[model samples]
Target: AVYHMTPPSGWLCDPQRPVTTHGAYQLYYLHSDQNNGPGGWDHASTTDGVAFTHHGTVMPLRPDFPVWSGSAVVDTANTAGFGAGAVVALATQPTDGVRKYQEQYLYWSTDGGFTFTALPDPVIVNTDGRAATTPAEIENAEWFRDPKIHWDTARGEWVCVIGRLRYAAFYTSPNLRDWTLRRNFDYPNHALGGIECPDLFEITADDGTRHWVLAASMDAYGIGLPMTYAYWTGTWDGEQFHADDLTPQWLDWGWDWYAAVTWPSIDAPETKRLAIAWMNNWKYAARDVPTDASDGYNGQNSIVRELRLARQPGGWYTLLSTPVAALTNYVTATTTLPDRTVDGSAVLPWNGRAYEIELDIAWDTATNVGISVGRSPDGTRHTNIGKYGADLYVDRGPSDLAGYSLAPYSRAAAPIDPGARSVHLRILVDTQSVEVFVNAGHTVLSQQVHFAEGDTGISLYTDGGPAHFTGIVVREIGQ
Candidate 1:
């Protein structure tokens, strides 16, 4: 078994795509702490989806081209089939010096996971024929990078998803050299603050039907869905991408999982999809207490999820996800704790390991709500995470969403509106902290409850009423 990087240290957000051709999984992203340095691109691999070993940083930061963001992939099926294990990556580099983050660069990796050589200049320059043409174009430094590459087997070409604010451009490369451009293909994306980390791919359904999928996101929209992109499912034409544009899609309606990306799972290619994201988004990155415990490592890789397609109303497949199945291996049958009624504020037991729990509330009152925090082991000092009021609020984790940082975890709004019925709160507690799927997923109950590993238990309640809790189950997760 090989040792891997876990929280308490640092983690990479966007996961590197895994190739079926190579029995290895690649993990990549802006490592908050690059080998103890500031932040830079880092890579590590896992032979098996579970229990991955490290090879250190396979790619290095360029003096001229800082390792910004973007992703890597094998150019052609031939390269993938030849067991070339060695391939090329389309990385985002700042052509405008290190400070002025600009342009996207292309790099070639000859060895499967040993080293890489960056091209002297960028393949797609800043205004690489695809900058925003409209005045409303959201422009900035950190936004220019993030190029997504995909091969068009049907068209015999390659496509790159590049960010340009109002619109994300799909740049094409016939030979992974010269390029072409396509835009407005994924339109709703333009309405967003700006979409970064765009990944477009095609999946063949078990019914032999093929569907084109597009996943996009902007970290700025923290807490309450800053609004990202992902195609419901559609057929793709070579020159143009004709997707269902009108359909049900999962806009990552979670608490903090934003700007996340998925890789071709090392698990069965057809059955499972693996993905990652910056644990802390742009808004709260600075406020998050820095971790020096791992000797300078900070940041986290959001829960590695398995992307599954659900059958929708019109033969369209909708995007949704679940905890990766492989996670069960990390779960050990351990005694959690005996439930107790907390008349008021009282910190229960928790050592800080993320877990999932369901709470069935038998309300005895109507005004006050209980505060539960366990997204952090020592931090689960239950604050007002959910409220039973007139205006309910979710995604209220102390971020820029509500326009404040020092703010505490919030409820789904003031209208927690139990509406005469008892409420059940099923919460997903991650390392960074809480996501409550309240009232059977009706009203959202998002909260920023930070806790670490070893923390697992249930608490009592009040809004002035003593509530009875039934079906209280907790399942701890490991990283």
Candidate 2:
């Protein structure tokens, strides 16, 4: 049984629409016969985000237009005039071919989110109404795509964020159809490639103050960079967003997890933001990843996570994320390890392919301790996750099997508080992926790894001196 959502019969990537209605989440994604093939938005529904029931494609692929990545929303107040509670989506409509006149279009659904109907015309914001190849002839260099729309409660209007070249441009609309350009902010995204798949929203801090978050999926590494998300926290004044600082923060520091957007309306009494993203990188998504015709799928997504924004050292804010609390329903068996010190011998507490582990460690003077997952009998192949120099990291190099690239298998790390005494970690491992959340989601690292069918064990050890584990709990996930 797969712990994450995979397409029933084809390639799947980029979790979209994540809108909740009638107490169920309607998750949409990009589906194709293969990677980067002819595809459209496929729909799925889930009550708990663990097991999803797949519906067929929402709008099938057409010769004239193919549906690309975008965002969806439930129009509860008849803002667009389709109905009081219709579902609206904004997707890229390439005119004829791959890179020919990419434009954003709108579609509305009256009967929940099961079906959609196209509007008469294309959206007035991204469409050229015509086209040209030269950068000077098109709007924003013809790279204009990936539109994300939301209602701005603070401004009392509808806001739409779209990617343009290396930055994200904003537009305003009284209704969903007509849009007017507001302002554009330059993202310091150098050499990392174009910044696309933008998501913007308002969130509350721990002190009851309001802050705005602007995020875009971009390349995070320098050489042979991986696709990930970078965000900033500041204030939006209905016209433009002003970041608190120039330094941006990454949503996740792993090889996977990109094109993520937050779910709306989950924070009324208080404030909480939920998100999901595709769990494959641009480097190996097409070729290196393992799949077979028998399974008929090539991609999957990371688990649903709740996002939190807290104050940082300077005027900036940091984003923290953890798996949804409802995921506890998958726990069928559990094992606990009491507080203990381990010098050399390894402690075995978990022996399964799918599980969740919680660990807290405090070192006397060791400076390093490790948790190894998916280990073989002799200890030659395993995924090591641990702390080093006050930072959290994951090493998947030893687990590299056939067809996977060696570039992404190296160690991936994220920084932590310099003055903290102990390190906290929450890890989830499935058949082909492992996600780690450190310090209540302060740092997140997600990687895609494949272990042998019969290989399954979890071990804990220390490298330097005595290390005390204050807490360790393992929960076995089942079908």
Candidate 3:
């Protein structure tokens, strides 16, 4: 995990939007002393996207009330009355001394986001008016948490979205203290389970068209949907959001990318957005994992990605995500391979632990063509990523020697264009994870693996017949 951000000691979960202040990006995440313990907000700053400087916990957790997920912004106009240029954050925690209900509280930083102080009261309270002391009571009560706040320049006010079970409740405020309920956004009927960590922002397409994107982390595993970020593209009219269609699109078609958050790029605020996600899933996060024993940390983050909107043939727009350009600054070595045709499999001459691989393949006469990475010397353990009949998939079942054996530990797949004969892939392989971007981020798959020591191998394979692989390049990445 040379390039990815991880917790310094115990555990980390959801990520808050990184706000720009004092010539750097101020990033915050939920941190705890142990797994599933009371959590607090930890702070870090990055001048470039690759190197991060930890500033310790800005908001420490109390034993009675611990802070959860939230969003932060730079209050340039002193709207909240703390001060001009203060960093204001809206976070959720238990309300009563018994830890019965959840509510939103305000915290502000006046010393350049290094420390924060509470405002002494909650801004938003539970609507159900019930004491949720038990699991069943908590589940049945009106769920309200994870408030995402942003400034709406068009209306000259602030906008917020809070997760309410399956719906995202929208609210507006003029000074960030007094808020009025606007509407309750409903997901499509097919989208099951609870929604958490809601975000709403405007993004510009490549054709110079602006659209609003609403996204949330869905906990819908029973319905066959991945516990990942699902988003919709549409319009926002200051009071309400109108989606273009009923169907929603997933931001990442993978198992581990969850609780994602995005912010506008400091340089290109309108045309480009930056995004990141927690690299562990709820399915196995609490269970025993290798990182806890090997590294003394329980969580890691995905690499920073640059996002852009692309219009499809049917006049619909989809988000395109790619690794940030700053990643190239850490390239230590480069290897280029000659074009070759493969019938069965061919092992590459180079091997490394942290690297990036780029490949362009023509699926001529071959039914299945792909690559095998993170392999053991005996060839018994390796993760497979390939294209099988109009679908792209990453299979980690063969490499699960650590007994992860969960439901989603097998394979994750996403559909590709049917009639396409050629495909492009960009894969980032870290020590314990793999992130695959297909066709320039039209589709993505990310997963975590625990390979044995010295299991750094790469190879190419074709099943039915011969296939041609061209423009293959591998670059080793480090700090």
The candidate that achieves the highest lDDT relative to the unseen native structure:
3
lDDT of model number 1: 0.54
* Deviation in Å, model 3, residue 371 alpha carbon: 0.2
Which candidate would rank higher by TM-score, 1 or 2? 2
Query: Whose TM-score is higher: candidate 2's or candidate 3's?
Result: 3
Flag regions of model 3 displaced more than 4 Å: 97-100, 131-142, 403-408
Question: How well is each residue in 7-48 modelled by candidate 3, as lDDT tens digits?
Answer: 887897898998899888899999998887888999988887
Ranking of all predicted structures according to TM-score, beginning with the best and ending with the worst: 3, 2, 1
User: What lDDT tens digits, residue by residue, belong to model 1 across residues 1-479?
Assistant: 01123433454544455443345676655654443244555665655444555556656654554566677776544443323444677767655453334777667775664567766777776652245544334244436667877877787788877765545567777656567766545454333455567777876554556677876665334434344334436655655656676432444444455566776665455445776554455445555342434245545555455565555567766554555566567654433455555454455555334566666655555465554544233443333454555443443342222223424423334234546446666566654455555552333333333432333443454667555555666766564
Worst 10 residues of 2 by lDDT: 124-133
Clashes of 3: 0
Q: Look at candidate 1 and tell me the lDDT of residue 133.
A: 44
Using TM-score as the measure, the top candidate is 3
Clashing pairs in 3: none
At residue 72, give the lDDT of candidate 3: 92
Candidate 2 lDDT score relative to the true structure:
0.78
